[PDB]
Structure 1
């Protein structure tokens, strides 16, 4: 039932909607979702490609923008920034009710900047200023350049959603960059209490990559095991004395955010990923259909930290089989960037 979203909040996890469109906001649906337990919104280039293609309310906006001397990218940005600012306004009461801990809307920078740290910083600062809302996060892929950019953006006071994480090692590198940016601001006497960062760690794409060649006792288990080990890493990193010294001064922990949590294999229950990854101080962003499956027949239980020993044993067998999860993670991040660039080019063509 609908109350499950509140039950999950009580277990310490926010549930965000992994979709955004002009009609979602204009219809009043997003506002009703925020009253019913949804706590935020994520977008990406694929989400916008599907929204622009299918939502009737973009037609008049595109016709208006084609009357202006603007690049396809600027037409896209005008549309997307407007959707994000409208969604931010819907989510602002929630955001302010928790002291700025919830109610975020994420907008991703152009995929072509993913390996350009300076260009990423410049675009992120610009989009942050263009949206002009305290509850907007700029979404940046967790490449090496993206972790460079994260440190700078954190030091600039900008909230960031670091995405396309598939690696525990890369995630730990992101925490260290965050901490360096927080330390910089504290040394300069600047505020840190409103800076929020999430680390979007992808789930289904790990199982999609491996399951066809895994032995039976591991099919459908690797992504959850990797996430459960990542959360143990998170507990260790943020409780250590080094970070505690920053949190004592007002720093917020980074939070893990489970992404790609729609089930893609019909052999698994449609709520598998949401049901399996509930723990305190985390986020799960879900597509519409998964949100409705979870409301209908999901289960609210603190599952993320259960049986961590078995998660470790499974990761040890994955390595025994010759699957290097760090090599896989790099490949999956690369593939995700190619897929996002393909979607971006597909949405730009009708805006020429």
Structure 2
């Protein structure tokens, strides 16, 4: 029931995992009935699935007999899994006018600084999946925000990932709005275009907690998220976006990612309990989902005590910690980590 209580506060909970058995077994479908509202993947999720899930072995053996690149073998397998998960989520998606029930597939991390290559791959994967409720996942580098505007103008739903920066998030909103405005100028639909901005949580605390004083440990990532949500409210309520929304456009939604707790000193539901607010998403790994169902709390926390969050961020700046510099480092490290997972994903498909 708690997932329903969180929907009543305006937040969707998505599952931050995907595998062939999760879908085929009916587990994912049961999750949609319990209140899960979507699925996210990334190269690490697929690396783990392909290595651990017995249902891939027959396809791998068959694909190794064809003149296909390792990447092509991976894509064949992953596109099938995403199409199958989309089909499980389609009734939910259609029941809300296309607002929920999405599955995300990320483009190759090799493309992260290549806008045109990102666009081409995203268009190809979008056409290969051929489902209305698939999102293409793109890292929010500067090239990614370039590609976002193009993809939105092409009518493709996007999950912008590896956001750690309030400034880079806001730049993504502007690129979104440019794409929507283009579509309205060309007489094209916008009501079915959905974008989420995946803003990473635990990695900020993992980076800073050792250096912070006791009173600030475990607070920065949440405070940064609360400030990002304030930025979101300001941007999307202002007159230019209000006019687009009145015509049928949807706002980008913040999506809290990296919400599994890594520090055992903190409650395992800390990063779900603390970030609940209106027109947001939280994507959770399976163990965190279980923990939240078991002993999480559904309260409107994201907009609570926002002044105290801003005070903490000022205190962090005064300690000489520049969260925008930190964000650039975390994004570059996350891209390296996804590229390493993608290479590890491809090696057994040779």
Using the size of structure 2 for normalisation, the TM-score is 1.00
How many Å apart are 1:92 and its aligned residue? 0.1
Alpha-carbon deviations, 1:106-159, whole Å to 9, x = none? 000000000000000000000000000000000000000000000000000000
Measured in 1, the distance between the counterparts of 2:331 and 2:11 equals: 25
What are structure 1's unaligned runs of at least 5 residues?
none
- 1:277 matched to which residue of 2? 275
How many Å apart are 1:24 and its aligned residue? 0.2
How many Å apart are 1:248 and its aligned residue? 0.8
Alpha-carbon deviations, 1:39-76, whole Å to 9, x = none? 00000000000000000001111001111110000000
Measured in 2, the distance between the counterparts of 1:65 and 1:94 equals: 33
Give the match's secondary structure for 2:210.
Answer: helix
Measured in 2, the distance between the counterparts of 1:321 and 1:52 equals: 44
Measured in 1, the distance between the counterparts of 2:151 and 2:183 equals: 11
Measured in 1, the distance between the counterparts of 2:236 and 2:111 equals: 30
Alpha-carbon deviations, 1:160-208, whole Å to 9, x = none? 0000000000000000000000000000010000000000000000000
Alpha-carbon deviations, 1:304-332, whole Å to 9, x = none? 00000000000001100111000000000
Measured in 1, the distance between the counterparts of 2:26 and 2:147 equals: 35
What are structure 2's unaligned runs of at least 5 residues?
none
Measured in 2, the distance between the counterparts of 1:136 and 1:311 equals: 34
Pairing 1:1-352 to 2, within 5 Å after superposition: 3-352=1-350
Give the match's secondary structure for 1:328.
Answer: helix
Alpha-carbon deviations, 1:271-319, whole Å to 9, x = none? 0000000001000000000000001100000000000000000000110
Alpha-carbon deviations, 1:187-230, whole Å to 9, x = none? 00100000000000000000000000101110000000000000
Measured in 1, the distance between the counterparts of 2:315 and 2:62 equals: 57
Measured in 2, the distance between the counterparts of 1:347 and 1:170 equals: 29
Measured in 2, the distance between the counterparts of 1:89 and 1:347 equals: 25
Give the match's secondary structure for 2:249.
Answer: coil
How many Å apart are 1:239 and its aligned residue? 0.3
Give the match's secondary structure for 2:54.
Answer: coil
Measured in 1, the distance between the counterparts of 2:163 and 2:293 equals: 27
Give the match's secondary structure for 1:212.
Answer: coil
Measured in 1, the distance between the counterparts of 2:249 and 2:120 equals: 24
Measured in 2, the distance between the counterparts of 1:127 and 1:85 equals: 11
Give the match's secondary structure for 1:205.
Answer: helix
How many Å apart are 1:15 and its aligned residue? 0.2
How many Å apart are 1:36 and its aligned residue? 0.8
Measured in 2, the distance between the counterparts of 1:96 and 1:308 equals: 35
List 4+ stretches of structure 1 deviating above 2 A: none
Give the match's secondary structure for 1:217.
Answer: helix
Measured in 2, the distance between the counterparts of 1:191 and 1:27 equals: 36
Give the match's secondary structure for 1:322.
Answer: coil
Using the size of structure 1 for normalisation, the TM-score is 0.99
> What is the aligned-residue RMSD (CA, Å)?
0.3
Measured in 2, the distance between the counterparts of 1:36 and 1:220 equals: 30
Measured in 2, the distance between the counterparts of 1:11 and 1:66 equals: 48
Measured in 2, the distance between the counterparts of 1:68 and 1:34 equals: 36
Give the match's secondary structure for 1:213.
Answer: coil
Measured in 2, the distance between the counterparts of 1:245 and 1:299 equals: 36
Measured in 2, the distance between the counterparts of 1:87 and 1:36 equals: 16
